[PDB]
Amino acid sequence: DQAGKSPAGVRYHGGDEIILQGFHWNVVREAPNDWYNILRQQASTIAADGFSAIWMPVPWRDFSSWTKSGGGEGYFWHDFNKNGRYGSDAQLRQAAGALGGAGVKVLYDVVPNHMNRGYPDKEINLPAGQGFWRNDCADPGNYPNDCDDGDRFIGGESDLNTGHPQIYGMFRDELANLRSGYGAGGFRFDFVRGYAPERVDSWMSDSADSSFCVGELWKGPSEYPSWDWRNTASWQQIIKDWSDRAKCPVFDFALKERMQNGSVADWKHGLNGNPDPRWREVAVTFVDNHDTGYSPGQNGGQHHWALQDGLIRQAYAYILTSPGTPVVYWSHMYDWGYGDFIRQLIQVRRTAGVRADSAISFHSGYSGLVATVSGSQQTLVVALNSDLANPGQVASGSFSEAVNASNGQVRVWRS
Ligand SMILES: OC[C@H]1O[C@H](O[C@H]2[C@H](O)[C@@H](O)[C@@H](O[C@H]3[C@H](O)[C@@H](O)[C@@H](O[C@H]4[C@H](O)[C@@H](O)[C@@H](O)O[C@@H]4CO)O[C@@H]3CO)O[C@@H]2CO)[C@H](O)[C@@H](O)[C@@H]1O
Ligand SMILES: [Ca+2]
Ligand SMILES: [Ca+2]
């Protein structure tokens, strides 16, 4: 495992990560108070499957509830107490220790934008009228105000002023706490549209400068005002700008948007396909997460933007053979039977030496997507939903078959 920032100072931890999202939306209901125990038991298997990192659920306890129904998943935490719906503080420490001991770095989902302000019994009690909250200032709509330099969560009544020195420090200290006491190797920043990207850079510089990080910016061009350059920009440009300012990798919602709306050929327009290595190397690619995807359990989870099953294998073959840093969703890997296929693709990635900044060229003249990827050890030819017959049609050199699945709809050859 190589460490190191990118040439532009972006915290992609060497560019060689392969990440497991270590939960789905309904874990707190499907395995009540037992998830950390399960992760501890599974740590050696996760490592053997080839993952270098695991994205853990929000560790801050969440006892919220609403009615569809939900609550408790971590995105409406009420304080930093770790005794929540995934397991106890002791069980978290044991799971993080087992994962780290198996060689899997532990990334915590953190949620600075808001908290369960109204929960009656909590350790963090911030009064009104001291600038701690967005709505201490006038709040006319979903955009920055004088107490919140980002967007708001729903009505904004629970948004924190993360730029207030006491609130900034509160999160700074808790990130340090996760690093010193809970084995954190990095962080996944939730809802980064809600606060300034430079604050993520500051938090990471203060508390985890050499760690991995990734931000979730999910905000399309149409959500920006008419006078903002982002209103007419590409999804790539929007997330890349965030990454530049946070000095942090960013989830590749440009690729996700193309997977949901475009053809397979169009997947080349994700951030991770950009010919500038400074652009593609900061992409964190994924197929679905706990928001976009289904989960086992009530209501099938959230499934706000889910990839149809006829493209799941193709999508994993693309992200696991291509540049950027790939994330595998728990339920594809361990609930729904794609594990053996994903295991094989992870081995292909590692054997070829594909990294976040590997070159990728796209080839015209065939159906579907045809790419050549320059790994540090091998060149890959990847053909998805394509009438390509053999790799010699598009690449020089000697190749052998590495993957052939879904009646040839997923084919990968290696030098
Ligand atoms: O005071 C603020 C608001 O409080 C109340 O809001 C409710 C919502 O109505 C519920 O839907 C729910 O919200 C969930 C949300 O549905 C869910 O998707 C998730 O959001 C995450 C996301 O998964 C994550 O990856 C990233 O994008 O950030 C998102 C936000 O953290 O989690 C939400 C919180 O559990 O719960 C809230 C709070 O109870 C009230 O109804 C609003 O009117 C009010 O403005
Ligand atoms: Ca690394
Ligand atoms: Ca906010």
Among the candidates 312, 327, 357, a domain finishes at 357
Q: Count how many domains the chain has.
A: 2
Let me know whether 353 and 363 are in one domain.
no
Which experimental technique did the depositors report for determining this structure?
X-ray
Let me know whether 113 and 137 are in one domain.
yes
Let me know whether 311 and 364 are in one domain.
no
For ligand 2, the distance from its centroid to the CA atom of residue 355, given in whole angstroms, is 10
Let me know whether 75 and 113 are in one domain.
yes
Round to whole Å and give the CA distance between 410 and 403: 7
- What number does the ligand 1 atom closest to the CA of 74 have? 35
- What residues form the annotated binding site? 1-2, 13, 16-17, 75-76, 113-114, 148, 151, 153-157, 159, 188, 194, 290, 302
Let me know whether 253 and 326 are in one domain.
yes
The residue segments making up the domain with residue 378 are 359-414
Beta bridge partners of 37: none
Let me know whether 121 and 215 are in one domain.
yes
- Joined together, the tokens standing for residue 50 give 């080839």
Among the candidates 309, 339, 357, a domain finishes at 357
Residue with CA at minimum distance from ligand 1 atom 44 = 155
Residue with CA at minimum distance from ligand 1 atom 7 = 66
Q: What is the CATH number of the domain that holds 178?
A: 3.20.20.80
- What number does the ligand 1 atom closest to the CA of 71 have? 35
Contact at 8 Å (CB) between 71 and 123? no
Let me know whether 216 and 236 are in one domain.
yes
Let me know whether 338 and 407 are in one domain.
no
Which residues are known catalytic residues? 190, 216
- What number does the ligand 1 atom closest to the CA of 73 have? 35
What are the angstrom distances between the C-alpha of 217 and each of 130, 188, 192, 251? 29, 11, 5, 7
Residue with CA at minimum distance from ligand 1 atom 21 = 75
Ligand closest in space to the Cα of 18: 2
Let me know whether 317 and 368 are in one domain.
no
Which residues are within 8 A (CB) of 203 and not within 5 positions of it... i.e. 6 or more apart? Answer: 112, 168, 171, 172, 175
